[PDB]
């Protein structure tokens, strides 16, 4: 029973560490997508503004 308790504690160690690593790996991709979306929004807004100003 004592060995099993030590084993479950080590297993929880590994599981939590893997979860944190996966979370960080998701964070980096989400930040990349966020940057792409920000650039797309800026370019679309500026294009619409300049088109509206040029229509007159």
């Amino acid at each position: 029973l004592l060995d099993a308790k030590a084993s479950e504690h080590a297993a929880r160690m590994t599981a939590m560490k893997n979860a944190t690593d996966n979370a960080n790996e998701l964070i980096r991709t989400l930040t990349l997508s966020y940057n792409r979306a920000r650039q797309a929004a800026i370019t679309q807004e500026i294009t619409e503004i300049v088109a509206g100003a040029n229509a007159l």
Partner: protein, 126 residues
């Protein structure tokens, strides 16, 4: 004349796109997503004519069931938001539920009715 009329607009998004094309060809200044400024007024004029006349006018009525087609279920788009802000309620249909053979694919959580209760018979209400 005192009758009761039901009108179904098969797609308001197509009408909005046609109006955008017409305005752009007329060389009017565009707004959000090249749409003209009065895109909201275009639908408000049409939908505000649906009413339940009083007893002095004759008691007639005219109910409307406009249709709006989303893109991948994007309810937050410009035209869907504009139409939702005008109509009383909305009924949402789900593609995933439609695929599983559930016809109609009504989404009960999202669908609301602003004239609920008064529009039902006593048994159905209870």
């Amino acid at each position: 004349k005192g009758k009761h009329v039901l009108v179904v607009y098969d797609d308001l998004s197509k009408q909005a796109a046609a109006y955008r094309e017409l305005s752009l060809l007329l060389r009017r200044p565009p707004g959000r997503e090249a749409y003209p400024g009065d895109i909201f007024y275009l639908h408000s004029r049409l939908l505000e004519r649906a009413a339940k006349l009083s007893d002095a006018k004759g008691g007639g009525s005219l109910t409307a069931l406009p249709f709006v087609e989303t893109q991948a279920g994007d309810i937050s788009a410009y035209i869907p938001t504009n139409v939702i802000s005008i109509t009383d309620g909305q009924i949402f249909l789900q593609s995933d539920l439609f695929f599983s053979g559930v016809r109609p694919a009504i989404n009960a959580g999202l669908s609301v009715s602003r004239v609920g209760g008064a529009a039902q018979i006593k048994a159905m209400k209870k």
